Amino acid sequence: ADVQQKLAELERQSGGRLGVALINTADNSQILYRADERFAMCXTSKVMAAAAVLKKSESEPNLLNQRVEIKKSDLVNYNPIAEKHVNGTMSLAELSAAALQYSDNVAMNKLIAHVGGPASVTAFARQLGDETFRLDRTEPTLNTAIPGDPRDTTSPRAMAQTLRNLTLGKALGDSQRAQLVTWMKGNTTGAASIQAGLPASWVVGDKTGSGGYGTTNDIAVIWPKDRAPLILVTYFTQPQPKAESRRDVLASAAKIVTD
Ligand SMILES: [Cl-]
């Protein structure tokens, strides 16, 4: 009850729309806030794309080493790693790491293309038992985050359940699951988001996202000190098309649900 009141107060103060789903694996409980509403995933969808490539690699041993050409025509709006590799190749492993750890949107597009496009990433989610996730578009248009638009959305409940399957469950083989977890633990973009609302000693693997309408998102697997792991999804979006980022709202939500 108190956690629900605190999240409602945070949402009101923020001016936007907040979605939270916590899974506590200690007792198989959930804390949910707007957890069945749809939110634009933005960059948080890169976890599903990387996982689809990892799944494909279970039956193709040379897959992560496969080379992909990077060209000027591949550049999109945010290319921190790929811009350094134009006119050479990157491996699928390198693209997965760049997408997950730097939010590189060329890397995301190469993962999407490799597996067959947005409908193939979506079909992979369905195969896992996630019937909510939809990836409709490529980068950069998947980030428009227009209110009322179901494209490129999921719910907090569904994303938390799927992230639990991918990182702690059996969606991926042991090598592939470990690789995903290692990649997420090495993320460089999340220190102001969920991590900022947790004690410094806790270990986090996370993936952020941002987009239009001030959309500010983070999804995480969390190892609290001497406790069973948690899964936390915090999704946030705002009424104004040009609203600014609000990573502090995600940190505040994380603090509320883990205190
Ligand atoms: Cl505006």
Numbering used by the authors: 28 to 286
Q: What do the authors report?
A:
To elucidate further the mechanism(s) of inhibition by enmetazobactam and tazobactam, we obtained cocrystals of CTX-M-15 with each of these compounds. Crystals were harvested and cryocooled 72 h (enmetazobactam) or 3 weeks (tazobactam) after initial setup (approximately the length of time it took crystals to grow and within 24 h of their appearance) and diffracted to a resolution of 1.14 Å or 0.91 Å, respectively. Inspection of difference maps in the active site revealed continuous electron density between Ser70 and Lys73, which was modeled as a covalent lysinoalanine cross-link with loss of the Ser70 hydroxyl group. Taken together with these findings, our high-resolution crystallographic data show that prolonged exposure of CTX-M-15 to either of the PAS inhibitors tazobactam and enmetazobactam results in covalent attachment of the Lys73 side chain N to the Ser70 Cβ atom and loss of the Ser70 hydroxyl. More significantly, the newly formed alanine at position 70 resulting from loss of the Ser70 hydroxyl has epimerized, resulting in a d-amino acid with the Cα atom in the R configuration, which at these resolutions is defined clearly by the crystallographic data. The active sites of CTX-M-15:tazobactam and CTX-M-15:enmetazobactam cocrystal structures are very similar, except that in the (ultrahigh-resolution) tazobactam cocrystal structure, Lys73, Ser130, and Asn132 could all be modeled in two conformations. In the minor conformer (occupancy, 0.4), the Ser130 side chain points toward Lys73. Further comparisons with uncomplexed CTX-M-15 show that cross-link formation elicits no significant change to the positioning of Glu166, the proposed general base for deacylation, or of the deacylating water molecule, Wat. In contrast to previous crystallographic investigations of β-lactam-derived BLIs such as tazobactam or clavulanic acid, our study did not identify additional inhibitor-derived products covalently attached to Ser70.
CTX-M-15 (cefotaximase-Munich-15) is a class A extended-spectrum β-lactamase (ESBL) capable of hydrolyzing penicillins and cephalosporins, including third- and fourth-generation cephalosporins such as ceftazidime and cefepime, respectively. It is predominantly plasmid mediated, disseminated worldwide, and encountered in diverse Gram-negative pathogens, mostly Enterobacterales, but occasionally also in nonfermenters. CTX-M-15, like other class A SBLs, employs an acylation-deacylation mechanism to hydrolyze β-lactam antibiotics, utilizing four invariant residues: Ser70, Lys73, Ser130, and Glu166. In this study, ultrahigh-resolution X-ray crystal structures and mass spectrometry revealed the mechanism of PAS inhibition of CTX-M-15, an extended-spectrum β-lactamase (ESBL) globally disseminated among Enterobacterales.
